[PDB]
């Protein structure tokens, strides 16, 4: 029993972390087999950063103006190319620590672990969710770019995120490992702001089920609701509209707990309308939304 914001073990990813420098700029890269992946903005000058043209910046660079380092050890760059918002650097030797992996693009609302890195070295690992507005509430400092987010299934690492920048409300933005940004953002120091955000309803419900699985039954009530009446309420409260698809997803957890989804929904309506009354659920005094149904199932069992 017990429930924690739990991240995947980061070892498989630690073995892939490298350092990339162009002139004065250094950030993190991801080294898989014979390629290193990193933010293309590693090539921008203090100037460049406001209105940079990356095709133009890239053509002025040689395989050899890229300094790639695995710890103290330089890796020879024998090829460079831009893929959307990433650079791919072919180096002259392979990473024997490359795990089984794939590149995936996640949907907002899903979670992944982030291995925060500086100068190619790991700082810590934490778990988070892609916000509905495509940002992440991360914990990054200057030089954290190139750090990656991932999920693990068995021996297979699914990479879904690489960090690119920080927005004015101190949340974070980045791309998938094909270099496509999540959200409307672009890699340049222009005025950009995260859009409206919403509470991930499906996750809040999952976390309520977690809590029932763990003897925290106080918020339950005798009522049920319809999907529509739930949405008319939750939406007054900055909650994502709930769909029948989302209901189905909760089926496993509904069965394990014998609590109807629409019943849990009724409970959720109460809590939003009436508040917690000093009370807590799974330790928290607020409703948590960074646990997917999958996260709950794997963790609670």
């Amino acid at each position: 029993s017990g429930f924690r914001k739990m991240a995947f073990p980061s070892g498989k990813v630690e073995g892939c972390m490298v350092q990339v420098t162009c002139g004065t700029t250094t950030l993190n890269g991801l080294w898989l087999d014979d390629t290193v992946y990193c933010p293309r903005h590693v090539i921008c000058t203090a100037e460049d950063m406001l209105n940079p043209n990356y095709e133009d910046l890239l053509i002025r660079k040689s395989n050899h103006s890229f300094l790639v380092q695995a710890g103290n050890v330089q890796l020879r760059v024998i090829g460079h190319s831009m893929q959307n918002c990433l650079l791919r650097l072919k180096v002259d030797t392979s990473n024997p620590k490359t795990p089984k992996y794939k590149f995936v693009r996640i949907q907002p609302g899903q979670t992944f672990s982030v291995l925060a890195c500086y100068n190619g070295s790991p700082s810590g690992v934490y778990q988070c969710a892609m916000r509905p507005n495509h940002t992440i509430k991360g914990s990054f400092l200057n030089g954290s770019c190139g750090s990656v987010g991932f999920n693990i299934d068995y021996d297979c690492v699914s990479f879904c995120y690489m960090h690119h920048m920080e927005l004015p409300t101190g949340v974070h933005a980045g791309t998938d490992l094909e270099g496509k940004f999540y959200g409307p953002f672009v890699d340049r120091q222009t005025a950009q702001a995260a859009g409206t955000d919403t509470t991930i309803t499906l996750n809040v419900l999952a976390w309520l089920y977690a809590a029932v699985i763990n003897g925290d039954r106080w918020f339950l009530n005798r009522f049920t609701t319809t999907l529509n009446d739930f949405n008319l309420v939750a939406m007054k409260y900055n909650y994502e509209p709930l769909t029948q698809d989302h209901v189905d997803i909760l089926g496993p957890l509904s069965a394990q707990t014998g609590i109807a989804v629409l019943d849990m929904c009724a409970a959720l309506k109460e809590l939003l309308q009436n508040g917690m009354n000093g009370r807590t659920i799974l330790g928290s005094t607020i409703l948590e939304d960074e646990f997917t149904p999958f996260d709950v199932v794997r963790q609670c069992s």
Partner: peptide, 4 residues
């Protein structure tokens, strides 16, 4: 934005 701030490239990080």
């Amino acid at each position: 934005a701030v490239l990080x």
